[PDB]
Write a protein that binds this ligand. Structure first.
Ligand SMILES: Cc1cn([C@H]2C[C@H](OP(=O)(O)O)[C@@H](COP(=O)(O)O)O2)c(=O)[nH]c1=O
Ligand SMILES: [Ca+2]
Length: 129
């Protein structure tokens, strides 16, 4: 897989963000994770975590997997990197997202993220507390 440029347009919630990609505005949904909705427990904390990560970065990058690049809603499906650090993994490692929506053919980083989840759950963090 390859990292490609994007620029933050606006934070949305723990697993979605609006970014400009190839010069067009898109809503991205993070691959392989599920954060709580803003109205659910840890929802606001997941939103805040992603917002800080993406806003504070000097650069963001999007990395598509081998399969579908957009979902049925027209959202981009990607791994999003903030100054080289993967937001999808960082959410899972903090217990602010579960590994989820693991579809065959768009699951390159599955095991990386499952390892992060096992660590979060061993540490009883957030959703696992
Ligand atoms: C993460 C991801 C979500 N989706 C779809 C499945 C879910 O459909 P439904 O809307 O019918 O439940 C929805 C979950 O997104 P949200 O967690 O953002 O609600 O997005 C994909 O199709 N591909 C994906 O990789
Ligand atoms: Ca969600």
């Amino acid at each position: 897989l390859h990292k490609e440029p994007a620029t933050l347009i606006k934070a949305i919630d723990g697993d979605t963000t609006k970014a400009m990609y190839k010069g067009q505005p898109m809503t991205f949904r993070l691959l392989l994770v599920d954060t709580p909705e803003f109205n659910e427990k840890y929802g606001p904390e997941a939103s805040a975590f992603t917002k800080k990560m993406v806003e504070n970065a000097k650069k963001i990058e999007v990395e598509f997997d081998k399969g579908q690049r957009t979902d049925k809603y027209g959202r981009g499906l990607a791994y999003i990197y903030a100054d080289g650090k993967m937001t999808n993994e960082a959410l899972v490692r903090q217990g602010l997202a579960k590994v989820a929506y693991v579809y065959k053919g768009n699951n390159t980083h599955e095991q990386l993220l499952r390892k992060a989840e096992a660590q979060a759950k061993k540490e009883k963090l957030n959703i696992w507390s």
